Amino acid sequence: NLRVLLDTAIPPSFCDTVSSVLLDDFNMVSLIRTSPADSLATIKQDNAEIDIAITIDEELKISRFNQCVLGYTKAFVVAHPQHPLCNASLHSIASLANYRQISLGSRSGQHSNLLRPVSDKVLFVENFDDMLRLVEAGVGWGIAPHYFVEERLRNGTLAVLSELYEPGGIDTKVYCYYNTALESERSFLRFLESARQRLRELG
Amino acid sequence: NLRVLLDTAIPPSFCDTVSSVLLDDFNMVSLIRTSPADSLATIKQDNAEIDIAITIDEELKISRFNQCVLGYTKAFVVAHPQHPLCNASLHSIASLANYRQISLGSRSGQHSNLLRPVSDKVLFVENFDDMLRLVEAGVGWGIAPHYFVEERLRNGTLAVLSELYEPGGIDTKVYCYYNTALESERSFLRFLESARQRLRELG
Ligand SMILES: CCCCCCc1nc(Cn2cnc3ccc(Cl)cc3c2=O)cs1
Ligand SMILES: CCCCCCc1nc(Cn2cnc3ccc(Cl)cc3c2=O)cs1
Secondary structure (H helix, E strand, O other): OEEEEEEOOOOHHHHHHHHHHHHHHOOOEEEEEEOHHHHHHHHHOOOOOOOEEEEOOOOOOEOOEEOOEEEEEOEEEEEOOOOHHHHOOOOHHHHOOOOOEEEEOOOOOOOOOOOOOOOOOEEEEOOHHHHHHHHHOOOOEEEEEHHHHHHHHHOOOOEEOOOOOOOOOOOEEEEEEEEHHHHOOHHHHHHHHHHHHHHHOOO | OEEEEEEOOOOHHHHHHHHHHHHHHOOOEEEEEEOHHHHHHHHHOOOOOOOEEEEOOOOOOEOOEEOOEEEEEEEEEEEOOOOHHHHOOOOHHHHOOOOOEEEEOOOOOOOOOOOOOOOOOEEEEOOHHHHHHHHHOOOOEEEEEHHHHHHHHHOOOOEEOOOOOOOOOEEEEEEEEEEHHHHOOHHHHHHHHHHHHHHHOOO
């Protein structure tokens, strides 16, 4: 049984690219969703017996776990279109520290450099749905995956703030953390090259 | 006088893209090179009176300074081709912690998460030339900009270790740190859009 972790920031397209390739080499494959804020925390528990984690979160070295880059994905800073910072100019790019942020909470209470909130007005939530609910209600701003806000943006329910900070959205590495055992096994190298190559060939 | 900092990790192509655009709006423009390890340390001294810094290094918020992304650039982990880890397989991807790394030193003695060395066998140097000199002599491995190793790689003097960790080289954001004053001034927005757009249109 190969236990596999995908954080909720991972696009579900990318989730099918992984779930597919693994079944080629593997008989039993358990798939687990987690907050990006809970991914690395989870795999560090020996109980969880996680073998592969696919997360946007970064940590320099982990016990018993190697890192590598599967690919890249986009994130946007979003707010209610009527939200004060709608003009999205460079004064708003610094004003975020002053306005309320809807940030992902972590069970572990702690946050990485990456997922730590930027403002002092912070309101924690377990997932991106709770986040964008509160953001649709002008309660604050937040950083969510592209696939979570693709719909609402065209439907005018949400606006972007990030385009001056980083045009085209915020490029974000998807890391593959894998148990050191797998580093030898060909079936794992298969998964890497396949998954990787299948996201190059899927924009 | 507009004081502008570019770390040595910034490609010199990208350096001409900046040096060009600024002269359109600005009369006096001082250009300063620095170790990526010394960039953010430098701009935090009030004496330095730096207005714009272009560096790969990251820090969440700085006093009096806003962040944004000008673009992306590539880095490789390189070694002498005869270096033990030449086979570049996934056991070598974890063995780096055991082999000697030629890491950039910082005057400030401190390092960011990004530029902190990975191994315990570390030998510090001031610049990428000292690094790749020692690396050509099989003394250890190091992470250098693409433009620093483009030559030596084709000329077989150096080999890559990174391609399993991150095929195509290690994607690296180039940040623009700018004094909060500039956030309003149109001439600065000019520089952003121009510099940015000129690196989209220069691969
Ligand atoms: C005008 C300032 C805008 C920059 C906001 C500060 C940033 N934060 C980050 C880390 N970060 C966080 N939350 C995510 C959620 C989802 C996804 Cl897909 C990515 C990410 C992410 O990269 C980068 S950029
Ligand atoms: C098999 C493990 C290989 C990963 C090595 C660990 C990394 N380190 C980093 C940060 N880092 C550092 N030094 C640079 C120098 C020059 C340039 Cl252009 C970039 C960078 C850089 O990103 C990322 S990846």
